[PDB]
Design a protein around this ligand. Structure first.
Ligand SMILES: [K+]
Ligand SMILES: [K+]
Ligand SMILES: [K+]
Ligand SMILES: [K+]
Ligand SMILES: [K+]
Ligand SMILES: [K+]
Ligand SMILES: [K+]
Ligand SMILES: [K+]
Ligand SMILES: [K+]
Ligand SMILES: [K+]
Ligand SMILES: [K+]
Ligand SMILES: [K+]
Ligand SMILES: [K+]
Ligand SMILES: [K+]
Ligand SMILES: [K+]
Ligand SMILES: [K+]
Ligand SMILES: [K+]
Ligand SMILES: [K+]
Ligand SMILES: [K+]
Ligand SMILES: [K+]
Ligand SMILES: [K+]
Ligand SMILES: [K+]
Ligand SMILES: [K+]
Ligand SMILES: [K+]
Ligand SMILES: [K+]
Ligand SMILES: [K+]
Ligand SMILES: [K+]
Ligand SMILES: [K+]
Ligand SMILES: [Mg+2]
Ligand SMILES: [Mg+2]
Ligand SMILES: [Mg+2]
Ligand SMILES: [Mg+2]
Ligand SMILES: [Mg+2]
Ligand SMILES: [Mg+2]
Ligand SMILES: [Mg+2]
Ligand SMILES: [Mg+2]
Ligand SMILES: [Mg+2]
Ligand SMILES: [Mg+2]
Ligand SMILES: [Mg+2]
Ligand SMILES: [Mg+2]
Ligand SMILES: [Mg+2]
Ligand SMILES: [Mg+2]
Ligand SMILES: [Mg+2]
Ligand SMILES: [Mg+2]
Ligand SMILES: [Mg+2]
Ligand SMILES: [Mg+2]
Ligand SMILES: [Mg+2]
Ligand SMILES: [Mg+2]
Ligand SMILES: [Mg+2]
Ligand SMILES: [Mg+2]
Ligand SMILES: [Mg+2]
Ligand SMILES: [Mg+2]
Ligand SMILES: [Mg+2]
Ligand SMILES: [Mg+2]
Ligand SMILES: [Mg+2]
Ligand SMILES: [Mg+2]
Ligand SMILES: [Mg+2]
Ligand SMILES: [Mg+2]
Ligand SMILES: [Mg+2]
Ligand SMILES: [Mg+2]
Ligand SMILES: [Mg+2]
Ligand SMILES: [Mg+2]
Ligand SMILES: [Mg+2]
Ligand SMILES: [Mg+2]
Ligand SMILES: [Mg+2]
Ligand SMILES: [Mg+2]
Ligand SMILES: [Mg+2]
Ligand SMILES: [Mg+2]
Ligand SMILES: [Mg+2]
Ligand SMILES: [Mg+2]
Ligand SMILES: [Mg+2]
Ligand SMILES: [Mg+2]
Ligand SMILES: [Mg+2]
Ligand SMILES: [Mg+2]
Ligand SMILES: [Mg+2]
Ligand SMILES: [Mg+2]
Ligand SMILES: [Mg+2]
Ligand SMILES: [Mg+2]
Ligand SMILES: [Mg+2]
Ligand SMILES: [Mg+2]
Ligand SMILES: [Mg+2]
Ligand SMILES: [Mg+2]
Ligand SMILES: [Mg+2]
Ligand SMILES: [Mg+2]
Ligand SMILES: [Mg+2]
Ligand SMILES: [Mg+2]
Ligand SMILES: [Mg+2]
Ligand SMILES: [Mg+2]
Ligand SMILES: [Mg+2]
Ligand SMILES: [Mg+2]
Ligand SMILES: [Mg+2]
Ligand SMILES: [Mg+2]
Ligand SMILES: [Mg+2]
Ligand SMILES: [Mg+2]
Ligand SMILES: [Mg+2]
Ligand SMILES: [Mg+2]
Ligand SMILES: [Mg+2]
Ligand SMILES: [Mg+2]
Ligand SMILES: [Mg+2]
Ligand SMILES: [Mg+2]
Ligand SMILES: [Mg+2]
Ligand SMILES: [Mg+2]
Ligand SMILES: [Mg+2]
Ligand SMILES: [Mg+2]
Ligand SMILES: [Mg+2]
Ligand SMILES: [Mg+2]
Ligand SMILES: [Mg+2]
Ligand SMILES: [Mg+2]
Ligand SMILES: [Mg+2]
Ligand SMILES: [Mg+2]
Ligand SMILES: [Mg+2]
Ligand SMILES: [Mg+2]
Ligand SMILES: [Mg+2]
Ligand SMILES: [Mg+2]
Ligand SMILES: [Mg+2]
Ligand SMILES: [Mg+2]
Ligand SMILES: [Mg+2]
Ligand SMILES: [Mg+2]
Ligand SMILES: [Mg+2]
Ligand SMILES: [Mg+2]
Ligand SMILES: [Mg+2]
Ligand SMILES: [Mg+2]
Ligand SMILES: [Mg+2]
Ligand SMILES: [Mg+2]
Ligand SMILES: [Mg+2]
Ligand SMILES: [Mg+2]
Ligand SMILES: [Mg+2]
Ligand SMILES: [Mg+2]
Ligand SMILES: [Mg+2]
Ligand SMILES: [Mg+2]
Ligand SMILES: [Mg+2]
Ligand SMILES: [Mg+2]
Ligand SMILES: [Mg+2]
Ligand SMILES: [Mg+2]
Ligand SMILES: [Mg+2]
Ligand SMILES: [Mg+2]
Ligand SMILES: [Mg+2]
Ligand SMILES: [Mg+2]
Ligand SMILES: [Mg+2]
Ligand SMILES: [Mg+2]
Length: 116
RNA sequence: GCUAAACCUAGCCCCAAACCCACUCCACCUUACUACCAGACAACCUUAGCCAAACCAUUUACCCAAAUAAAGUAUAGGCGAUAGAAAUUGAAACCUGGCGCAAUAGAUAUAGUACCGCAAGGGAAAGAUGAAAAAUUAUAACCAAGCAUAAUAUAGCAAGGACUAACCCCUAUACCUUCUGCAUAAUGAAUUAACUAGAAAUAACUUUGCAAGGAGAGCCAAAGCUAAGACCCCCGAAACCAGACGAGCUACCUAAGAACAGCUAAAAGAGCACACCCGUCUAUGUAGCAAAAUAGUGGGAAGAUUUAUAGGUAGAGGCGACAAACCUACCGAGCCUGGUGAUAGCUGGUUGUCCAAGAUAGAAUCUUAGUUCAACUUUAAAUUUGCCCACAGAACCCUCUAAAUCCCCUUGUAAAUUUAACUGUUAGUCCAAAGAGGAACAGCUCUUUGGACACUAGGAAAAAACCUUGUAGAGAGAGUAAAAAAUUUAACACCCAUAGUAGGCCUAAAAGCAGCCACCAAUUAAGAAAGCGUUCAAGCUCAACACCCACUACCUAAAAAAUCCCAAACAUAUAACUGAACUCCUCACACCCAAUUGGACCAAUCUAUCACCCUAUAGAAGAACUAAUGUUAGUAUAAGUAACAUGAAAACAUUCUCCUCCGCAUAAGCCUGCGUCAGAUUAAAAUGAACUGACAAUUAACAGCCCAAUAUCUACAAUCAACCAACAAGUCAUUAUUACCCUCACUGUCAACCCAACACAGGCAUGCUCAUAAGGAAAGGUUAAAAAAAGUAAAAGGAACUCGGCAAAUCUUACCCCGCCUGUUUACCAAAAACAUCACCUCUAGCAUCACCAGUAUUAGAGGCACCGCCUGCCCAGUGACACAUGUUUAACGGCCGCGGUACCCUAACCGUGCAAAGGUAGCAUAAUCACUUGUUCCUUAAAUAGGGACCUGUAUGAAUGGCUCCACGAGGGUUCAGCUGUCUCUUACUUUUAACCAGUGAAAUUGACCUGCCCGUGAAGAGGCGGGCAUAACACAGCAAGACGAGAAGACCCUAUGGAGCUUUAAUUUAUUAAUGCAAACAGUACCAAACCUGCAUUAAAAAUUUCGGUUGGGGCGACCUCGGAGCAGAACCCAACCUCCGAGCAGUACAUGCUAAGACUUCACCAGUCAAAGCGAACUACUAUACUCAAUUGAUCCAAUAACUUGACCAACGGAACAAGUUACCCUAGGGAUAACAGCGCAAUCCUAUUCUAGAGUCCAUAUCAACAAUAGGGUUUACGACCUCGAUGUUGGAUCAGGACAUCCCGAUGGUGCAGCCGCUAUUAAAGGUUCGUUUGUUCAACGAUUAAAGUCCUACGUGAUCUGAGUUCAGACCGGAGUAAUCCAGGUCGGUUUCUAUCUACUUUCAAAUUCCUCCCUGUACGAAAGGACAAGAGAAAUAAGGCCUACUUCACAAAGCGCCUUCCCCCGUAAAUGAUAUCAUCUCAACUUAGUAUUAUACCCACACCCACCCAAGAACAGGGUUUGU
RNA sequence: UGGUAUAUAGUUUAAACAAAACGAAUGAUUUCGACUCAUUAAAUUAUGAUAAUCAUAUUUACCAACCA
RNA sequence: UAGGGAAUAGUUUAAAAAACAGCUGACUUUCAAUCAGCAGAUGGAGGUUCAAUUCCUCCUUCCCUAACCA
């Protein structure tokens, strides 16, 4: 009988992006394999780890994935990060979580091919 | 032992072969089956649609002249669904058979007959001996249901375990379907027999053959190829189209006919009133007399009347005084056949045994009742890891610094992935936990984690979701698991008090105690005062001393609903026992999940070959029925029930009694259908006969069946036809000339009769009779209960009944609304205010040989309004029409304002301003007119939501969509005087019918099976069937209607379906058709130019056609929403919903290598799409965090179109998008749904109600006489909501009548406590449910108001108790009006008039709770107690009444061997809330859940009933039957 | 019963610390008056809290309703 | 309860203008009319934009519509 009002909120129907870690600590990866996806920089690229447009971390070499805590030093051109470290107390250091790939195989080997 | 059972032929089916094709005579196209006369009418012309496309709109296979192959190829196509060649290639061919049926099969077939239908057309059923029936006292018996032989004994899904024993004991909630879940009161089923339902490609698998080849040309082939085997149901709509058949009913019309007494007036669409026509109201009837009737009452009855006969109009239609009427007994558009096995995402159904595995995140979708992908699940195969998991490791911003997860060697285990091939599931329930919404309600809704259920067992009482427990068998063995409810409450001090001082101040006063300051001090000891109190004072307590032991607790305070409480019981014998399908023991072992899937066996039948008292191995298939409101047949149940029938006596000769609705004849129709003989047949009836067989019969004068030609003639009604007067202007006639001498044939003739399925209470024209000279019988017999039906009479009253004076009686006044009037309509729920109508007005048309019309603008046609009377106002902006250059037109569609201010208020002549085409004029007005509204006032009634007259901005009155008056009329609606009455107070008596009993005959719906109880509880939420209790030998008959969610009709309300149809339109598409215009074509004439018809191509109208009308949704509608991104819910890998909470997007800017290419990866849970990228080529570069731009989303598939190419194109926003389609249905239809609303129940308790706790405030003071705020704690289930659990193959819904059952939260009556209780009246609380709780006016009302009363006129529940008991005013279909909405169809919370209420009782229950009675008033006490006065009791006692219950007839009254009331008689106990004594714990006191005493209690008292084979028969104050009483009154 | 509005001099009426209006008085003015002008008197439904705002009950207004 | 629209000088309208009203004068014996001058406005709050009656958002007042079916 008595009619009621409607909800005034629209949208909010987006689905999950299925982002996060794809390769955990100790996993074996091949060159090109995506290690992690993210919308903001939660994990930073370390050794033999590339970063794409969308902050996607991928393996540059074949090997084992490792996660570490390292000291963060921004690039001087980056003004937002450089305007933050100049306001820190003398003695403080910023830390961030980096992901690395420890290579497994060597670049190659020298083989005998002829005896001239 | 009956009924029955059983059979093998009749013939039929599919092929082959072969082309096929008459006859005695007579008759047959007119009314077919009819001997015989003047004619000329003639045949051809695209099938459409269902359906498919999941809608639909282009489109959607249908032999078309050779099997195979080419080939499902070329090609076509909303390039979708699907459709689909050819060239070319090139085979075989002996009718006489059957792994076909065998009487529900096979042809429908014993036959296109019987029968149904006007017609087209539809369309059956069944038989059974034997060699011989010229062997008929024959051919044995044994078998379905149903019965009989032979009824029954506490108790219960009917059995099982058993047992000496049938029953008694113990255990046990029918089946199918459908669901989250059914004993469910959800579906289907009476039962027996028979019949009745899974059809196939692709690929793959299995088993042979051959093998780089296979195959009996085609084709395939990187082990393939050939062959075989093995997988895809049944019934059902409303509809659509084509072609036939129908106007003997009905609607209208044509031709020529008929009927209408009597009276009044004599003029009549006049009145009274027969025949006749219609069908107003009431009752009855409701499977009937009747698929629309009967009785009574009513309307009309010389006209727009009624009616017989023949003919005409036919479904894309007709007809229509429009009711969406009627067109052969369901017309929103007929019937039949066919297309047609229409379609159905929907319901129902789906047939042998046994084992095994087996419950599922989600996405898209005109999609959420479905489907596809994924996920889960199954089988086969290959391979190698899967599950469990150690450290280490995974973010800052930030609020819960969460339980956890992700990753993961070891370890313990045995699964996992991949490949191949498939189906089903995709409508979820509770519990725990984390949360969202709602109300920190819901058996509520939405997500997540896990569990259980949808499988077994045990337990929690019964029990889907809680606990225990799972792997299957036998056992008269054992050990265990879970598993039983505990609690009982409030005593408390005694004793004593002098003084500075009335401290100071304030104050009228302030003295311990209104306020401010101080708060010192006397006495052994006592506050410049802690609580009451006083106007201020007085006055009473507390803190003090003394005395000596109060020598305490300071942890909780209640309860009430409705049929009947609910196991029975128990405080004391030593913790162990009982207890499963778990586990052990002896033996055995494939032997307990829906859908789905895999596998092992098999009945019968046919065929091949065996076999040979009924089998084997194989091959085949119409291969298996406890269920489809299934089909046919048989037989039960209801049920020997409902219902049906014959006037009397007698010599069967006749007579008597009573009806007379008639009767006789003709026409029509029918066709031998009560004449004789006979009968085994038949009626209720083993004389009669309408049935069977034979025989006979209706005789023409009545009637029917007619006529030579040509030309020609026919002005003057009828009505007693004469006066007279009319309009509606009428039914009757010849002559001339020619031709023409035979004559009585043929047919109908009966009856008790036709149309309605009937030997039907219906329908049926005319003449005479008009109450009969003709024709008929209401009672089978008895009894004389209820209820019911039809009548008669009724004391006193006289509408108090009721929605209403319905009905009955009686013979009557006045008024209002609507419509003028007679008239017409929804055959079968509406007769009316609706339609028509005289009159008025608008529009169109200047004319002839089939309508209008044999007419000509004083005409005809299309429409509106509705006689008359007074009137019909303003608007042409918009739409339309006309005219076309403006323009014209509303008696065409339609429309006809607002703001602010001013005379005290109200109002505004007036002032200011804007808009419009014009601004609602006259009039009327609380209306039949949205709501407000029961508006105000007068009349009317004792009392008025009624009615009438007025007042009235009515903001939604209003003028030919006609407005306002006024005669007459009305089965219209409303009010009323008077009278009348059984309508009512308040019923009663009698008669008839029915009824019951006897006799005869003998139905229907219904039926899972039944060995068919009550209470409470439980439960799919309302139990005869479950749990706990109570009750209980068996059995008929008559009554009742509370229940069996009783019977009946697959709900008509509501929702759903990409289901239908009707109507409307500014929905989409289209103009075939019709009309007009233009061009062309055709055609001619003297640079100009050609009539029309016809054809083609365009344009514009008209009138139509086809198709559709999205979804989500705490039912639908309205509103809102539909794609993408960020945040929270979701805290830590990923994922996660709500019509949940917030913020955003549908770009922009910079580059111009945002160039080419390419490993490896992520992925919005599928697909599609989307995303990140090393190296490399080529560039750039030595500075630019440059080498995939910044930016969060910043977006759109295929086809198609454009384009030379590159490339571009949709707010396809319903955003995975249909190339293009809206409304309405109450005129509606079909399929379903309790998956989904409205009534009811159930849950919940926000709202509502009640109580308690708290003590601010009110009450002069005074918190608790009384009332009560802010809040708190519980309970109730009467309101309004919310939820969607049972029911939509039906649970009938308001109020009232009838009868009431129950709760107490008590309205009166009773007993008590308190009072701001003097008394009389009251307020409040405790206890009490035995008894009682009125009549009236308006309203449909429940309520409410009012009038008069009462001791009181209680609150609630019982399916808002009760419709198989009633009522239908209201609500709530089909008709209609008003206002409003809309272009219209149509619609509204609106108002108004009208509108069919079925049921024969099978079961349960009940049908004498036998018998104590309640209250008011009067007198008296008493003018007493009380009291200033006014005023005015209780108790005791007495008397008289009312009601109720139970009886009776002396009188009265209705009546009369009797029954009744209006009359008379009788009527008997109590209830418990408290108030008081004695007296301990606690030596006072204290009514004591202390022992005890009293008010103060009934084994409710007693009363009633109490014997028993004379009993055939009769009588009765006894009674339905039976029974009972009497007969010492059995001629 | 329900909610929704409600209140201001003596009345009438904006607004609450109280504004204007009718009437009253007073003068100014006129030969005297009316008009006019000026001046004066005159009020917040009352109860409890915030401290002047919410409540509290009244007060009259205002619409709502058995049901099928 | 749901939904749409509106708010501009004291008043009524327009896309920051007019009209009156008001104030100041002239004309008239006086008033009115007339003539000549002067003033006054974007309900409220918040935000974008250099700039907002003119782009959005919430609140107040008022208006209109719907509030249905059994
Ligand atoms: K369809
Ligand atoms: K047959
Ligand atoms: K059920
Ligand atoms: K049912
Ligand atoms: K059932
Ligand atoms: K069934
Ligand atoms: K005819
Ligand atoms: K069903
Ligand atoms: K569906
Ligand atoms: K004092
Ligand atoms: K006959
Ligand atoms: K009849
Ligand atoms: K006679
Ligand atoms: K009729
Ligand atoms: K009538
Ligand atoms: K016009
Ligand atoms: K009236
Ligand atoms: K009146
Ligand atoms: K009109
Ligand atoms: K009438
Ligand atoms: K009587
Ligand atoms: K009954
Ligand atoms: K029923
Ligand atoms: K709901
Ligand atoms: K869509
Ligand atoms: K609720
Ligand atoms: K139902
Ligand atoms: K005591
Ligand atoms: Mg989100
Ligand atoms: Mg989501
Ligand atoms: Mg289709
Ligand atoms: Mg060919
Ligand atoms: Mg046959
Ligand atoms: Mg038998
Ligand atoms: Mg038993
Ligand atoms: Mg079955
Ligand atoms: Mg259900
Ligand atoms: Mg059950
Ligand atoms: Mg039952
Ligand atoms: Mg059903
Ligand atoms: Mg098959
Ligand atoms: Mg069609
Ligand atoms: Mg047709
Ligand atoms: Mg006829
Ligand atoms: Mg006839
Ligand atoms: Mg005629
Ligand atoms: Mg006459
Ligand atoms: Mg007459
Ligand atoms: Mg008459
Ligand atoms: Mg007619
Ligand atoms: Mg009509
Ligand atoms: Mg109609
Ligand atoms: Mg079908
Ligand atoms: Mg199994
Ligand atoms: Mg779509
Ligand atoms: Mg689904
Ligand atoms: Mg591992
Ligand atoms: Mg799913
Ligand atoms: Mg639930
Ligand atoms: Mg003192
Ligand atoms: Mg003093
Ligand atoms: Mg003092
Ligand atoms: Mg004293
Ligand atoms: Mg005092
Ligand atoms: Mg003091
Ligand atoms: Mg003391
Ligand atoms: Mg045991
Ligand atoms: Mg076991
Ligand atoms: Mg076993
Ligand atoms: Mg066998
Ligand atoms: Mg066999
Ligand atoms: Mg079969
Ligand atoms: Mg059978
Ligand atoms: Mg059957
Ligand atoms: Mg019976
Ligand atoms: Mg009978
Ligand atoms: Mg009879
Ligand atoms: Mg004759
Ligand atoms: Mg005769
Ligand atoms: Mg008789
Ligand atoms: Mg009889
Ligand atoms: Mg009777
Ligand atoms: Mg009488
Ligand atoms: Mg009355
Ligand atoms: Mg009267
Ligand atoms: Mg009455
Ligand atoms: Mg009458
Ligand atoms: Mg009339
Ligand atoms: Mg007249
Ligand atoms: Mg009718
Ligand atoms: Mg009628
Ligand atoms: Mg009329
Ligand atoms: Mg007019
Ligand atoms: Mg005005
Ligand atoms: Mg005024
Ligand atoms: Mg007027
Ligand atoms: Mg009205
Ligand atoms: Mg009356
Ligand atoms: Mg009007
Ligand atoms: Mg009108
Ligand atoms: Mg009348
Ligand atoms: Mg009439
Ligand atoms: Mg009998
Ligand atoms: Mg049944
Ligand atoms: Mg029960
Ligand atoms: Mg009986
Ligand atoms: Mg009965
Ligand atoms: Mg149904
Ligand atoms: Mg459709
Ligand atoms: Mg269709
Ligand atoms: Mg659509
Ligand atoms: Mg919908
Ligand atoms: Mg809804
Ligand atoms: Mg909408
Ligand atoms: Mg994916
Ligand atoms: Mg590179
Ligand atoms: Mg979509
Ligand atoms: Mg998507
Ligand atoms: Mg209607
Ligand atoms: Mg139906
Ligand atoms: Mg339900
Ligand atoms: Mg309900
Ligand atoms: Mg029920
Ligand atoms: Mg409750
Ligand atoms: Mg007080
Ligand atoms: Mg639910
Ligand atoms: Mg049923
Ligand atoms: Mg009580
Ligand atoms: Mg009572
Ligand atoms: Mg009821
Ligand atoms: Mg009943
Ligand atoms: Mg009625
Ligand atoms: Mg009515
Ligand atoms: Mg109307
Ligand atoms: Mg009537
Ligand atoms: Mg009835
Ligand atoms: Mg006395
Ligand atoms: Mg004592
Ligand atoms: Mg003592
Ligand atoms: Mg003077």
């Amino acid at each position: 009988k008595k009619s009621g009002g409607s909800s005034k909120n629209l949208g909010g129907k987006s689905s999950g992006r299925r982002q996060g870690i794809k390769k955990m600590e100790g996993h074996y990866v091949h060159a090109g394999n995506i290690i992690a996806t993210q919308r903001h920089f939660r994990w930073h690229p370390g050794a033999h780890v590339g970063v794409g447009k969308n902050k996607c971390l991928y393996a540059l070499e074949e090997g084992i994935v490792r996660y570490t805590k390292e000291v963060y030093v921004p690039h001087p051109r980056n003004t937002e990060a450089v305007d933050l470290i100049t306001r820190l107390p003398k003695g403080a250091v910023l830390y961030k979580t980096f992901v690395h790939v420890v290579p497994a195989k060597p670049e190659g080997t020298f083989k005998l091919v002829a005896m001239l």
